Structure formats: structure tokens, C-alpha cells
């Protein structure tokens, strides 16, 4: 029963369900019997922590394709890189 | 996205489980069934 961590991309194994995600507070109201919550396309987007019975959202962590903007090798060797789909607080 | 939830003939549709509960030499047969199957689903999306 290792302690919970939030807002970090942490691999997780709950009561038999395992995935890698950032776990954050959830506004979803789960009925008592329900353990996990799945969105359309069979992906688990919510889990209820067994120890404190609290609903925690799961969101995949960042993955975007770096692209390189080059003035052209003949003009210059400078380049600028676009990390796609990343809020620029997680790039380093 | 749904084809990611189909066995294609392996023991399971989850890569973690096939690897976790099987020995390394015999898991490769089961992953190769998923890789041939999942690759066929991507070739059909790209042609269509």
C-alpha cells in the first residue's frame, strides 16, 4: 500500500489495474459499487483509491513530436525546435 | 482504437500481462501475434 502521489507522470498499480498516468482530483460522482471509470473507446480515465475511497482522474502524460525549423544549411546552422502539443513548462 | 482491445490470438490484449505472467522466450510468440495484428489495423487505416 505505497503512498499516493499526484500531478506527476507515475506508473501505477491499483487493485489489479495498472497504467502510467498523472493522477489528479476528480469531480466525477461514482456510485458505491463502481471501482474504475471508463470513457468511450474502452480507456480507463478514472480510478477510486481503495484506501481513502476517493475518485482520482488519470490523464496520459505528454507525448509530442519534436520538429526542427531550419533557415536552410546554406543560409545558417541555427535551428528552432517545435515540441508539438506540450505546454511549455514540461519541455526540459 | 478498438482494435487495441482484440487478442488476435494471443493469451491477452494487454502487453504488460503477456510479458509479466510469461517467461521471456515464450512471450515473444505471443507479442509477435499482437504486432502482426496491430500492424494490419494501422495499414488498413492508412490505405483507407
Amino acid at each position: 500500500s505505497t503512498n499516493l502521489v499526484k500531478n506527476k507522470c507515475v506508473n501505477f498499480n491499483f487493485n489489479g489495474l495498472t497504467g502510467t498516468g498523472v493522477l489528479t482530483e476528480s469531480n466525477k460522482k461514482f456510485l458505491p459499487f463502481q471501482q474504475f471509470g471508463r470513457d468511450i473507446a474502452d480507456t480507463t480515465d478514472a480510478v477510486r483509491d481503495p484506501q481513502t475511497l476517493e475518485i482520482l482522474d488519470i490523464t496520459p502524460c505528454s507525448f509530442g513530436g519534436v520538429s526542427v525549423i531550419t533557415p536552410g544549411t546554406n543560409t545558417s546552422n541555427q535551428v528552432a525546435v517545435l515540441y508539438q502539443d506540450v505546454n511549455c513548462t514540461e519541455v526540459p | 482504437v478498438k482494435q487495441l482491445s482484440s487478442n488476435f490470438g494471443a493469451i491477452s490484449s494487454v502487453l504488460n500481462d503477456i510479458l509479466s505472467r510469461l517467461d521471456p522466450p515464450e512471450a515473444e510468440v505471443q507479442i509477435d501475434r499482437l504486432i502482426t495484428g496491430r500492424l494490419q489495423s494501422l495499414q488498413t487505416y492508412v490505405t483507407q
Binding site: 480507456t43 496520459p60 513530436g65 508539438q84 | -
Partner: peptide
């Protein structure tokens, strides 16, 4: 145009259009 517009995951990303 307003009338017209109103009437109208995992490894997958939707790139944005160049002319907004």
C-alpha cells in the same frame, strides 16, 4: 457563416490547420 458554423488519446495527435 455564423449560421453555417453553428449548424455544423494514445499515439494519435491532430495537428492544427495553418489558415485559422
Amino acid at each position: 457563416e455564423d449560421l453555417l458554423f453553428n449548424k455544423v488519446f494514445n499515439g494519435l495527435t491532430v495537428l492544427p490547420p495553418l489558415l485559422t
